[PDB]
Amino acid sequence: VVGGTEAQRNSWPSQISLQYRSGSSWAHTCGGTLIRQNWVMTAAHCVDRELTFRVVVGEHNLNQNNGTEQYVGVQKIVVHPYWNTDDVAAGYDIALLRLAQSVTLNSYVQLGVLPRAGTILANNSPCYITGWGLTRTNGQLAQTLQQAYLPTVDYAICSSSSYWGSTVKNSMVCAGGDGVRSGCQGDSGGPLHCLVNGQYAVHGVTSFVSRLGCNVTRKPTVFTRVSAYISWINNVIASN
Ligand SMILES: [Ca+2]
């Protein structure tokens, strides 16, 4: 997250860190949202590589002991069957991970609230992106969880020519684009939390930013629209 601020420890208890094993260590690669004690929602592009992955819940600082983390292996990776890695702009960038163990819920580990199916946010709706992603274009990951205020940009505007044009689909949510704050690599897969009727819900799964860079004016961060995928998510969870 470029232009973010450090999140409070208990603000976003559905945020997870998806990590892969590299030698004898583990490296954060993406975010996700805990949606059941034993399921995580993330981006399909986060699990394109044939890696060994674990999920960390209750994580705050990637480089130091918080006294709150639970570490759990990934038992099953269900990618959306229309996902194509060579075409992020086609959408379907979503995947569900079944965890090898159910995690324990507490202040730091909670299920993410998801929007009702079909819900679309008005233009300029208040949202925060969260993650440990790069803090600058071509920069480095944050040690502590960051958040950035990223108001949505409606589809009519987002899919216009000076924004993302036809690159953006109605199955996506755009947010930010102020040239200062944005998601960035390593935020992928994580939540966009938006305020609706008093309640934050996870309306987005972070998908992509411009090839030009992370915080680019009129290139808002793009997210998979969670409310387009409710039936899909239920169907998976019901049959795995
Ligand atoms: Ca930690």
Swiss-Prot record:
It is found in: Secreted. Binds 1 Ca(2+) ion per subunit. Pancreas. Basal layers of the epidermis, hair follicle and sebaceous gland epithelia (at protein level). Its EC number is 3.4.21.36. The keyword GTP-binding does not apply. Its cofactor is Ca(2+). GO terms for cellular component: extracellular space. The active site is at residues 45, 93, 188. Residues 1-238 form the Peptidase S1 domain. Disulfide bonds join 30-46, 127-194, 158-174, 184-214. GO terms for molecular function: metal ion binding; serine-type endopeptidase activity. It is an enzyme of class 3 (hydrolase). It catalyses: Hydrolysis of proteins, including elastin. Preferential cleavage: Ala-|-Xaa. InterPro entries: Peptidase_S1_Elastase_sf, Peptidase_S1_PA, Peptidase_S1_PA_chymotrypsin, Peptidase_S1A, Trypsin_dom, TRYPSIN_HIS, TRYPSIN_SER. Serine proteases that hydrolyze many proteins in addition to elastin. PANTHER family: CHYMOTRYPSIN-LIKE ELASTASE FAMILY MEMBER, CHYMOTRYPSIN-LIKE ELASTASE FAMILY MEMBER 1. This is Chymotrypsin-like elastase family member 1. It comes from Sus scrofa (Pig).
